[PDB]
Design a protein around this ligand. Structure first.
Ligand SMILES: [Ca+2]
Lengths: 52, 220
């Protein structure tokens, strides 16, 4: 798998590692989840989320 | 906004509204606790009041946070004389930080590359307390609308474009408000509302101002 298909299954950001593997990544206020694809809050109120 | 629908409390917690001599004359978006992004033509110099956590401007919902603007940074290339609606983006420094919560939350801003990729998804949300009809009064409760991305040629039937795009409609009072794209339940800023007039809508491409935004809105 690579970034050019389905954003490498990365929820937010995808980058190609030096061994033909996807390195998923997230924006400020989020961290990479246990599944190595999804993005979860790293602070109480991260950007761009509805909390209600 | 015309032909949209009523927003839900805390559905667009990055949305803010600008108050001057008249209430709700423009919109904006929360970049961070101390910074707002909006359209340059909304911001004259006069006393601006930013209101976050706003839902209905008539009712006191105990979610609102009013702030004074102490610094206005219109983009260096913006010139009211000449175009007026090109490089149509500004930043507002608030007097006191916003207290972030469920009703007051910033909008995510990706890098130049992904902001554009998100734009090309083809569907973004626009919102504000602009006019409900063409010459109708300003909205009481926050309105939102899903507007599709329009191609180069189709829109050109009317743009500096490089830093602008078309979709749709946004109306008077919505200017400066967010065009937002939702990716897997997280919303990213993909444009600023420039104008609609005939309530396609014309928008500023956020992608080309990301670095400028991040730089000027650095918290220290
Ligand atoms: Ca209110």
């Amino acid at each position: 798998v690579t970034c050019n298909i389905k954003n490498g299954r990365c929820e937010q950001f995808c980058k190609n590692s030096a061994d033909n593997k996807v390195v998923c990544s997230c924006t400020e206020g989020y961290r990479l989840a246990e599944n190595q694809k999804s993005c979860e809050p790293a602070v109480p109120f991260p950007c761009g989320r509805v909390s209600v | 906004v015309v032909g949209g629908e009523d927003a839900k409390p805390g559905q667009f917690p990055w949305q803010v509204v600008l108050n001057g001599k008249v209430d709700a004359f423009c919109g904006g978006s929360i970049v961070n606790e101390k910074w707002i992004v909006t359209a340059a033509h909304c911001v004259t110099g006069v006393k601006i009041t930013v209101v976050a956590g706003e839902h209905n401007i008539e009712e006191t919902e105990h979610t609102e946070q009013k702030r004074n603007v102490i610094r206005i940074i219109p983009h260096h290339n913006y010139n009211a004389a000449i175009n007026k609606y090109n490089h149509d983006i500004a930043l507002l420094e608030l007097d006191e930080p916003l207290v972030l919560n469920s009703y007051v939350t910033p909008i995510c801003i990706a890098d130049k590359e992904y902001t554009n990729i998100f734009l090309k998804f083809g569907s973004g949300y626009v919102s504000g307390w602009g006019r409900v009809f063409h010459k109708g009064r300003s909205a009481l409760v926050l309105q939102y609308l899903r507007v599709p991305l329009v191609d180069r040629a189709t829109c050109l039937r009317s743009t500096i474009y490089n830093n602008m795009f078309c979709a749709g409609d946004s109306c008077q009072g919505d200017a400066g408000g967010p065009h937002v794209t939702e990716v897997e339940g997280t919303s990213f800023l993909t444009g600023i509302i420039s104008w609609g007039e005939e309530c396609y809508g014309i928008y500023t491409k956020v992608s080309r101002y990301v670095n400028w935004i991040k730089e000027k809105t650095k918290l220290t």
